[PDB]
Homo-oligomer: A and B are copies of this chain.
């Protein structure tokens, strides 16, 4: 196995396949075949593969090398460096300028593969749309809940919409985006680590994303990268049951102003329970907080509200999470009563919605 490639063509591929990395799981599989260098990283649950065209002379073969060390070596070389690689006995030699390195290898035959599987559902969409869908909801996934199905994100196809749902039992985020293709009605759960990796592969360019879903796997092709993950078992909740049936009390306020006020009130909220109370009245919102030391905060804001007066408590962190996710001018809070969830949205888009349980 031999290849010579410019540093600039290896960096991002190495970054992508090595980021999240059986000592052999700490290695990258390298394969030179048919004028292509393939780089693969896996943790047995998911896999990233990068392809890199080889325009200079090369020789076929495969090996595995320590991912972090190989990446750090390549990153450490100067801009414009050309990196010559060749296998020599048990070691992989890496040469650039008068910098030389000899890395240990493990046999390519030992590198684990995911099970083969069939694609049942496919569609393509812009990168910017997948980014939007993931960023809108990702913060609301559970982290290590014993309900394993919540440690991850729902990807649902319906009509021509792709929808993501994330919830941890206390708060929920949902976002739907049209993708201009007839889709079957289908849902899968992607594990939270796979969601993060998928997000990280979205470079910001105009390369479209191709998605393939099987019964136990999801795959995403973007540019010269292929990401594959297993799915999570279990019955995900139905976001329509979490959305308030009829939250017909509508409050509108500046996002930044609202966030600032909550963030200040939070300072004097209970350090564990983070409770704040909201008093809504005609064109006015009052937020209060207090803690076991009897310290107290009060914020009063102008808002647009024409409904009945009411009072409700929330965990302020959950609300701040939403407002930070929104990135918009004005927010709409949609209320039911003092003992029911609240729905929050961008006042100028219903494309994402957030639900927070009351305290």
Contact = CB atoms under 8 A, between A and B. Distances in A.
B264 A77 contact: yes
A181 interface: no
- The copy count of this chain in the complex is 2
Contacts of A54: none
B76 A267 contact: yes
Given A76-B260, A260-B76, A69 B267 contact: yes
Given A69-B267, A268-B69, A296 B101 contact: yes
Q: Max chain B CB contacts within 10 Å: which of A73, A77, A102? A: A102
Interface stretch (A199-207, A231-239, A297-305): A297-305
Contact of A98 (B78, B91, B299): B299
Interface string A77-103: 110000000000001000000111111
Contact of A103 (B263, B295, B299): B295
A12 B261 CA distance: 22
B267 A73 contact: yes
Interface of chain A, main secondary structure: mixed
A294 interface: yes
A98 B295 contact: no
Contacts of A103: 268, 295
A76 B320 CA distance: 14
A300 B295 CA distance: 64
Contact of A102 (B72, B264, B296, B299): B296
A338 interface: no
A78 B257 CA distance: 9
B295 A99 contact: no
Given A72-B267, A267-B69, A268-B69, A297 B100 contact: yes
Interface in A278-317: 293-301
A99 B263 contact: no
Given A98-B299, A102-B268, A104-B295, 16 more contacts: A69-B267, A69-B268, A69-B295, A76-B267, A99-B298, A99-B299, A99-B300, A100-B296, A100-B297, A100-B298, A101-B264, A101-B297, A101-B298, A102-B294, A102-B297, A103-B295
Interface of A: 69, 72-73, 76-78, 91, 98-104, 260-261, 263-264, 267-268, 293-301
